[PDB]
Amino acid sequence: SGNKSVKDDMLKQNLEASGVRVGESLDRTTIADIEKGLEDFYYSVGKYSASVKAVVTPLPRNRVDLKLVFQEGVSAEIQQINIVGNHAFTTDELISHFQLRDEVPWWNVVGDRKYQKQKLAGDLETLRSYYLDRGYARFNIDSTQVSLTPDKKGIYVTVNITEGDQYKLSGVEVSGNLAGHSAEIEQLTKIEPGELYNGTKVTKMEDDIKKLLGRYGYAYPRVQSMPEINDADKTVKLRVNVDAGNRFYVRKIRFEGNDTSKDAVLRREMRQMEGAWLGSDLVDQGKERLNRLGFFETVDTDTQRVPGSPDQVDVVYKVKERNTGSFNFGIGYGTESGVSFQAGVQQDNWLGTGYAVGINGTKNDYQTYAELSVTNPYFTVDGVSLGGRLFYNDFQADDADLSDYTNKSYGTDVTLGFPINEYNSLRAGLGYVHNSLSNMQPQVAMWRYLYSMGEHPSTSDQDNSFKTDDFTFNYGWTYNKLDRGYFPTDGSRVNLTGKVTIPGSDNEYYKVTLDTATYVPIDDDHKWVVLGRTRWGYGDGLGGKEMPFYENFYAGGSSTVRGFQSNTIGPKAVYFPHQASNYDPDYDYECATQDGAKDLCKSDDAVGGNAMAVASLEFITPTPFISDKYANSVRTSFFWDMGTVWDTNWDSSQYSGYPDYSDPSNIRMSAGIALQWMSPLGPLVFSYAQPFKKYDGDKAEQFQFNIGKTW
Amino acid sequence: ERVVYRPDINQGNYLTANDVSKIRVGMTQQQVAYALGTPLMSDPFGTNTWFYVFRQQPGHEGVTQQTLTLTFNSSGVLTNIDNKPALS
Amino acid sequence: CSSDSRYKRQVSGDEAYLEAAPLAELHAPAGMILPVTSGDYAIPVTNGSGAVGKALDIRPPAQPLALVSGARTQFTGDTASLLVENGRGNTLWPQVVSVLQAKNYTITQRDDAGQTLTTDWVQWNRLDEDEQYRGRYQISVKPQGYQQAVTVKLLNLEQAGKPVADAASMQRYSTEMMNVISAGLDKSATDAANAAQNRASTTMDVQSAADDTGLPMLVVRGPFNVVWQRLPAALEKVGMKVTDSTRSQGNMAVTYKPLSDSDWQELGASDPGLASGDYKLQVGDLDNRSSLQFIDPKGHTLTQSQNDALVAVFQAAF
Amino acid sequence: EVPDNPPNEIYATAQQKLQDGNWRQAITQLEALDNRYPFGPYSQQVQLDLIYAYYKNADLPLAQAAIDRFIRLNPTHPNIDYVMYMRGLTNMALDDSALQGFFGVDRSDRDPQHARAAFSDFSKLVRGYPNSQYTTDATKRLVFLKDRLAKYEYSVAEYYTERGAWVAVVNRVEGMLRDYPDTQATRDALPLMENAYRQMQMNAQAEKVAKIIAANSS
Known part of the structure; x- marks a missing residue:
């Protein structure tokens, strides 16, 4: 009771070290000891005048209750940090690198002038390194005095030093039992003529020699450097004694x-x-x-x-x-127009076997989406992978009649990956897909594609159908050098995917996608990171055909551009007049229909495009309020996303009045804050984004919640 | 095959020409261990034999093996040296 | 979602380990030996008489309880023994007989002169057991040396109307009978002690004498139980109504309540000026003394001047 | 949250809850009875009941801590063999998974640390107290644990056979022969050692291993 700074946990562990623990006996003679120890701790932090007094109250059946009354004062603040004897450098420059702060600028509100003994010792070490890295080789801290104002809130620091002279390295002489690697060691002890002595360079050289020896099995060598100083001409000759030892x-x-x-x-x-x-x-x-x-x-x-x-x-x-999996699940309808359910099971390490198994689907009154994927990362000892995928999607509208935009698709895919380097890996596979569209609402892009395929559907009536069986050869290449697997703090990952329809397929086309994610740490602890992410995509037909409109790229969402509605960026549909297959009381029909006008009025329905490019710059920062024990289970970032999708085949000559969707200039942008949490149901991502740049028809969505790894 | 990357599978204990020449008949087991290092493979059955096998398989480059068999007597005194420089 | 009564007495798992293949030694071909066994994983050859799998009771063995007295108590195979405070002279036998009659247990043979008796079949009720057991017992009182002790011997047990021979049940029910008798005797003893404590009223004088910690305490010249019981009322008188308390820990907390000068002279021997925050109190145990310690809401202890105001009388409120 | 009723009432309530099978409330009552009256007539019985409840409540680390405390405080308690058996059971329980058990996964390839600890505990119990009533079950569990540990070594040797690390395979099978000579996993592993010897062109050792296999064909 009474402690406002020292937590009960640290205190309780301090108690057990001294033998004071629940269920044990009370060693009265140790009371004073513990008290003094705690007071000492409070003095190390700089909280002088603090008191820690123990009260033992007798409870029946020969028991006691120990209450530690803490009465902490006001922490003392460093009034000054003085260095006496620095004629080559200046006090300001030397203490700028110090952990202890003499003063704090008004703008900086994250640091204070509190004192700590360990920080002072590290500070002296930093000063010694600073003076030794400039070639002085004789810097000595004569003494260090820590004073304190009589009111005990004005602690003072002083360091008396002697710089000595500046020396230069005459040459490194390496000798001992080099185990036959002398030639490779002389290259680690190369010095430029006349270069000034440098302690950190010598330490790095010793570490390099130790690492070089260790690469050959000499796990426990001894390397010691004893520099011989010569004040006659101010030159230091290094003497690195090396003993490799035994090969382990x-x-x-x-x-x-x-x-x-x-x-x-x-x-x-x-x-x-x-x-x-x-x-x-x-x-x-x-x-x-x-x-x-x-x-x-x-x-x-x-x-x-x-x-x-x-x-x-x-x-x-x-x-x-670690929990390698996600269990996305939700219900959308409940009792409106029937019932619906969703599944999202995804496991990267299924039952510890290493298999990647993902099954997800959605059953509605109009949809029967199902998808299964199983991949063995090691189908061969060397790491050859063998994957497989089955999917079956259906759209029927639950009417069992015409004018329903029936769309039934199903396909298979087999993949085979193999490494080529320690980081690079190629992939080749074969896929088959069948798509059957029917009763399509006429639109400029879809009808253009259908004409490219040789079909001539009516522009007025919705009666139409189209069946296509496509066999594709899939290829890919992944370069992975990330620091970690879930929350990387260094390294880059690049994934290229593509497919081409092999001759014999109904429609000929090719498609390629390229992801990228680079993590650059700025802090030595890898707590502040910069993440540059990008995604590119391009597809087009081969012969006189065109890329199918169901293979188009979509942007905008929690995975591409946060702040926009999912699959909302890009070209918008343009509908021809129908003059038939119109439901007057439905009122859901678009502008271009019998009930409405008879022109090519543009709608707001996103259709995607055959070219896509999105980028994103993120700043990863530590969570402001979270215990360090759960530091790696949550990640906070500030993101700025850009993205655009355009249709290269859009004919601007015709439809001149309508927007030109072939222009990549229209680049959406967004900025905001994102939080990722590794919950029991996998990764959960919350993000608030403002799309400060948007174009007509872009549906904004500031707050987004997502299940599973976005990318 | 021949395109799937395979790391180097080093197996056995390192042997050098000088080290192999440093051992001669009549050497005690401790002296042999000092000269060549503790073997990674002995004869678990009823024989006092030491096997110094030196395997290297860089991956799609062929496997090279040098095997040195040292047979001691009951007293631990080296009795026979059998050096095989390459595989058959 | 679905359970059965038997999950209580079995091991958490499965009987898969009972299907493990047996261990067979390897034959050494002539002309060579097999590697010398480490012996670190050698299984001693034991007897397979006890139960295995789900037929084994992992329920903790029943240890005889020394409730009536703190003297030695011990069970050995089929008999339990429990020493008593000194020997109680010849009153131990009538006391045990009265405690036995408390549970209307039938007695067939009586040896009051020799301090021995036998009991007719007794029925037990345990939710643990799927089938209730029953058996006979023999109770005697004899001196073990400088003291008089009670011994119980379990003649036999029966479950499902069939005899039993497992030592686990025998120990369990011998300890059950011994604990029942001992708990009856201890209940009588503690009832007498509680009556004596209630009769012995204690003075409510207060004092401000400090202790080894250096702080003053609202000491009360009484045992812990009575002063602890009367402290809530006294704190209510001064308006510091108790909201949380712990008899076994001594810690207690109060809440502020505004009382005027007339209220303070009514009871509470005036205002200590504690007029802000949630305060906490602690009590002590000294069979004639009892220290009361107060702490400020900030986590500090009240000074002598702060509590001296209440020490004026601090007696009528109790 | 536990009332301060006299000790007998608290113990009776704890016993009733234990009999009813409500492990959590019995655990709370026993903890209250143990931390209120540390050294009383209930100490040993309460500690044993706490061990049992922690085991049945899947609070295995707490059960291990309680077992260690009981063993160190009462090294010569008459019912000490039961505590050793319970420690063996706890360690064996830490070596199990329910999700993998449902799908029929052979867990002999996973971490054998807890299996080794359980084997040590059961061996201690069996050697120290041959006549205890838990000795037969302890022996059966020891046999199962020995088989599992040998299967783990077999898995490692099989993987290194797949990798082409012949020295590692030979060393692993030799360790199996020295440690678990009489298990089925060693019999299965013997041909792996012969193959490893053959690949390194040491035909004498391969012939010796083949003779061993032939003499123990079954």
Whole structure:
């Protein structure tokens, strides 16, 4: 009671360390100890004058209750940070890199002038590094004084230093047991003539030598540099003593925490063989591949020396399993015009077997959409993938008569992927699709496509039909180097997909799509990121035909341009007069009909286009109010999205009065804030976006909620 | 095949010409282990034999193996060296 | 959604482990040996007399309870023994007989001179058991050395009208009878103790003496139970009505209520000036003394001057 | 939330709830009775009942903590074998999945850590108390756990056979022979060791393994 800054959790753990725990005995002699300890903690933070006094009240049956009355004061603030003896640099420049702040600018309201002993020690280390990286090689902190105003709210800091002279590196001399890699080490100890000494460079050189040795199995070498200083001409000669040691071999590779995933699922991602000489680079590659898999929340490695053995180690990968799946589900009608239901099951690691299984569909009175997809990422040991997909979509309008826009489609697809590098992988497959449209409302784009196919449907009556069986060859290429599998903080992923109708199909065309997502971290902790995402698409017919209008690209939504209604960006339909197949009392018929006018009046129904290009720039920031324990389960970002869809075949010569949909200039834009949460039902994305740039017919939708990975 | 990328499958323990030449008959087991390192493969049945196998399979390039069999007596004194430089 | 009475006594899982293939040793061909076994995963050869699978009771064994007294209590195979406070002279036998009659348990043989008796069949009621058991018991009172103890022997058990021989049920029901007798005796003892405590009224004098922590406390010269019971009323008198309390923890909380000067001289020995926030209180246990500690809403402790105002009388309110 | 009725009433309520099978309320009552009266006539019985309720309530970490506390506080309690058996059961329960069990998935390829812990606990119980009433079930569970651990090693050896890592396969099968000689998984793995020896062109070792297989054809 009384503590306003130190949480009860940290206090409670501090209690157990001293033996004070519920159910145990009360060691009275330790009371003073604990009290003093807590006070010391309050003094480390700078909260001098704080008191922590313990009260023991006797409860019956020989029991006690321990109440720790905290009375914290006002935290002291650093009044000054002074460096005495700095003649080469200036106090302002030196302390600008300090964690402790002497003063805070009025604009900066995220930092304070609070004191901490550990921060002071790190600050002294930073100053020492600053002076040693400029070639002084003699910088010494003579003393450090931390003072305090008599009112105990004015802490002061002072550092007395001696810069010494500036030295230059005469040359690095490396000697010892180099294990035959001397030639490759001389290239790591190359120095420019007359270059100034630099401590961080020497440390990096030592680390590079250690890493170079480790790549050949020398897991435990010793590298020490003892620079010999010569003040006669102010030159320092480095002396790197290296002892490679013994070459280590891996005995067993063990996996812990994979309570669901199969053992082979983790082993198949290993570049380090079990009964072979160790390679640290191979172990790191295996860890990175496991991280990129996306099946595990966290992955760690531990190389443990085998007891009683100077040559063998055990590599242990410790993983934390993650919920790899989404369960999108909803009901739209309930009791209006019948009943409806939806399914969204999607698993990336089905029962820990590594299979990717996704089944989703929608059953309505007018729709019977069903889709199944099963892919084995490892159909061969090397990583050859074998996928498959079945889909069946139906549109009947639940009328069983004419003038209903019947559209029944169904198709199959088989894919086969295989790697070519550690990051690149190609894909080839065969797909079949059957599409049967009937009773189509006349429109300029759809009728143009139908004419391109050689059909001549009437422009007035809705009576019409069209059947097409298409066999397509699908190809693809994925380059994946992302840091992680679900919330990347580095690296880029590029996915190219395409299809071409092989001769013999009803309609000839080709289509290609290209995604891209690049994560660039600005913070060393990878907590602030910049995400540049883009998507491109182009399709067209091969012979005298045209790309089918059901393969068109759609933009706008929670996946392409947030802030717009789904599949709303792009060309809008233009309807011809009907003069037949009109329902006067329905009132749902469009402008161009018997009940309405008899011109090509433009509607607001999005039809998509055969060319698409969308980009997006995102800034990933830490969630403002969330415990760091759940930091990786939620992501907050500020996004600016751009997008456009146009129909390259739109004839501007005709329909001059109507908008020209072949112009890619009309670029929609939006900006807003998005939040992604890894809930039990998979990823949930909330986003609020304002579309400050929009064109006629664009239906805006500021708030959007989505289930499952957007992209 | 021949186009699917396959990583290098290194198997066994590293052997070098100098290291193999550093071992001669009459050497004790501890001396052999010091010279060449602890073997990754012995004979679990009734024989005191050490197998130093050196496999490398770069992937679509052929597998090369050098196998050095060291037979000791009951006392642990090296008795026979059998060096096979390449596969048959 | 669907359950059965038997899920209570069985293991959480399945009997799959009972279908595991047996272990067979490997024959070593002539001219060579097999690798020496580590012995880390060697299964000792035991007897397969006990139950396996769902026929095994994982219900915790019934430990005899030393309720009447804190002396030693122990069961061994078929008999339970429980020592009592000192030996109670010859009154232990009549006390046990009276507690036995409390449950109208029938007795056939009597050895009051020798302190031994037998009981006719007794029926038990446990929701755990699908079928209710029953059996006979023998109760005696004998001295184990410097003290007098009660011993019970379970003659036999019967479930579904059939005899039983499993040690689990025998131990369970021997402990059941011993605990029943002991709980009756302890109930009599605690009723007598409660009557004595209620009769022994305690003074309500208050004091401001501090303790090892250095703070003053509204000490009350009485045992914990009575002062704790009377503190809610006293706090109500001063307007600090209790909203949360914990007898086993001592912690309690009050809420502000405005009382004028006339109300404060009526009861509560005047205003300490605590007129803001939710305050908390703690009590102590000292069989003749009892410390009352107050803390401010900010989380601090009241100073001596703050509580000295109430210490004036702070006695009529209790 | 638990009233402060005298100790006997609280214990009776806890026993009634345990008999009724409401694990959560019985657990709450027992926790109240244990943290109110830490050292009383109910201490041992309450701790045992808490262990049992935690096990039946799927609060396995709490059951393990309670078991450790009971073992360390009462190293020579007469009913200590029951606590060891319960620890074995808890560790074996941590090695199970219901969703995978529904679909008939063989989980021998997953983490064997909890299976190893359960084997250690059951072996301790069986060796320490041969005459306990839980010894037969403990032996059966030990046999099952040995088979499962050998199947795990077999899975690893099979994967490395697929990968072409022959030294790893040989070492894994040798470890199986040294650790689980009498399991079926070792018999299945023996041909893998012979194949690994053949691939590395060490024909003498392959012949020895083939002789071993022939002598134990079944």
